[PDB]
Amino acid sequence: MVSLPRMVYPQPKVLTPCRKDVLVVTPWLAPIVWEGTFNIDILNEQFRLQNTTIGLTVFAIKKYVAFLKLFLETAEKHFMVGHRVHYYVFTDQPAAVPRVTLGTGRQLSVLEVCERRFLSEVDYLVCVDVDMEFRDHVGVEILTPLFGTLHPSFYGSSREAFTYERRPQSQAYIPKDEGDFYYMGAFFGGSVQEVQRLTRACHQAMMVDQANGIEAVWHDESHLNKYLLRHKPTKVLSPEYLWDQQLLGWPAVLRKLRFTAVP
Ligand SMILES: CCCCCCO[C@@H]1O[C@H](CO)[C@H](O)[C@H](N)[C@H]1O[C@@H]1O[C@@H](C)[C@@H](O)[C@@H](O)[C@@H]1O
Ligand SMILES: [Hg+2]
Ligand SMILES: [Hg+2]
Ligand SMILES: [Hg+2]
Ligand SMILES: [Hg+2]
């Protein structure tokens, strides 16, 4: 909205692709975020000028509350550093939430287990799984109206191999000749409005399936993939944002491992 100040940085080269080893934009012109495709300095400026607030939601029920400490501590070092962050921890054990020291401009709310709340408190919602840890930068380069993350096991696979729900009886059904990517349900988000639309669409599709006595092969994730097939995300995050070094190592195609599973 407001003018960016004078900035000094390398001139982008029109005849020099940033990455030649991977696809950096989808067929519907949504960027695919890989290290080397963005200048974080320009992006931080753009979002700071808008005083952007990012909500980060995690669900820690039962034994998963044990992952909160590492999750929050690492988020403090790598997630949206410099911008306003509001952590939303949904848990069945309010008292078990660890007391983690937060940087300025960042807050955490514990919700024991309305959507209207999100609309007035944050500009974007990022929904992730709690049994993870941040190992590198995860910033505003991911912010957009709607984004999904490439599942680390299928980013190089053909659609036929994607583990979409294949039964026509399911609302999450996707035939073998359809599909752009296989997105993992452990990392998605976008504007509050778009995220609520996605979740509302998924919840309704799941109810319909339940009534028909059917459960999608990969539950929530199956419906997420159906939704993102019909409502193309405005950005797609590379596997840099959802990886497991123990199971997949550290391929050359990944210059950074930013968000990973906990052994
Ligand atoms: C970073 C995960 C590495 C790949 C492991 C296999 O992942 C599973 O893939 C299916 C779709 O084919 C679903 O996405 C499952 N939810 C994935 O399971 C993952 O691994 C298991 C062991 C659990 O940790 C689960 O929470 C993970 O998503
Ligand atoms: Hg969410
Ligand atoms: Hg979530
Ligand atoms: Hg759902
Ligand atoms: Hg969903």
* DSSP output for 153-175: TTTTS-GGGS--B--TTSTTB--
Answer yes or no: is 221 a known binding residue: yes
Cα distances (Å, whole numbers) of residue 92 to 59, 65, 72, 214, 248: 9, 9, 17, 28, 32
As a 3-state breakdown, the chain gives helix, strand, coil percent values, each rounded to 5, of: 30, 20, 45
115 in active site:
no
Alpha carbons 221 and 227: distance in angstroms, whole number: 10
The closest alpha carbon to 212, from 179, 178, 165, 176, belongs to 165
CB 172 within 8 A of CB 164: yes
The closest alpha carbon to 118, from 48, 49, 200, 186, belongs to 200
Answer yes or no: is 16 a known binding residue: no
* Beta carbon of 217 within 6 Å of any ligand 1 atom: no
Alpha carbons 189 and 70: distance in angstroms, whole number: 21
Alpha carbons 232 and 244: distance in angstroms, whole number: 26
Within 10 Å of residue 234's Cβ, how many Cβ atoms? 19
Within 10 Å of residue 224's Cβ, how many Cβ atoms? 23
Those residues whose C-beta lies under 8 Å from the C-beta of residue 119, and which sit 6 or more positions away, are 192, 193, 196
Pick from 154, 164, 218 the residue to mutate for probing ligand 1's pocket: most ligand atoms within 8 Å of its CB: 218
At 259, give phi and psi (nearest 5°).
-140, 115
Cα distances (Å, whole numbers) of residue 25 to 18, 19, 21, 165: 12, 11, 13, 26
Question: What is the whole-number distance in angstroms between the Cα of residue 177 and the centre of ligand 3?
Answer: 30
Which residues are bridge partners to 59 per DSSP? Answer: 90
Which residues are bridge partners to 13 per DSSP? Answer: none
Domain ranges of the chain: 1-263
Given the structure tokens 């929530």, which residue do they identify? 220
CATH fold of 1-263, please?
Answer: Spore Coat Polysaccharide Biosynthesis Protein SpsA; Chain A (3.90.550)
At 86, give phi and psi (nearest 5°).
-125, 110
Ligand 1, atom nearest to 244 Cα: 1
Ligand 1, atom nearest to 129 Cα: 26
Pick from 151, 243, 260 the residue to mutate for probing ligand 1's pocket: most ligand atoms within 8 Å of its CB: 151
| Residue positions counted in the chain | 263
* Beta carbon of 244 within 6 Å of any ligand 1 atom: yes
Alpha carbons 156 and 175: distance in angstroms, whole number: 19
Query: How far does CA 52 lie from the centroid of its chain?
Result: 17
Angle 123-127-132 from CA coordinates, rounded to 5°:
135
Q: Where are the alpha helices (DSSP H) in 122-255?
A: 192-211, 219-230, 245-248
Alpha carbons 9 and 52: distance in angstroms, whole number: 23
Given the structure tokens 């069945």, which residue do they identify? 92
Instruction: Extract the tokens encoding 143.
Output: 């912010």
Q: Can you tell me whether residue 21 is helix, strand or coil?
A: coil
Q: Give the resolution value in Å.
A: 2.0
CB 61 within 8 A of CB 112: no
Say which amino acid occupies 82. G
CB 183 within 8 A of CB 230: no
Provide the edge-to-edge strand list for the sheet that holds 187-191. Answer: 32-33, 235-237, 146-149, 187-191, 124-128, 53-60, 84-91, 106-112
CB 103 within 8 A of CB 86: no
Nearest protein CA to atom 27 of ligand 1, as residue: 186
* Beta carbon of 221 within 6 Å of any ligand 1 atom: yes
Given the structure tokens 């067929």, which residue do they identify? 27
First to last CA, the chain: 43
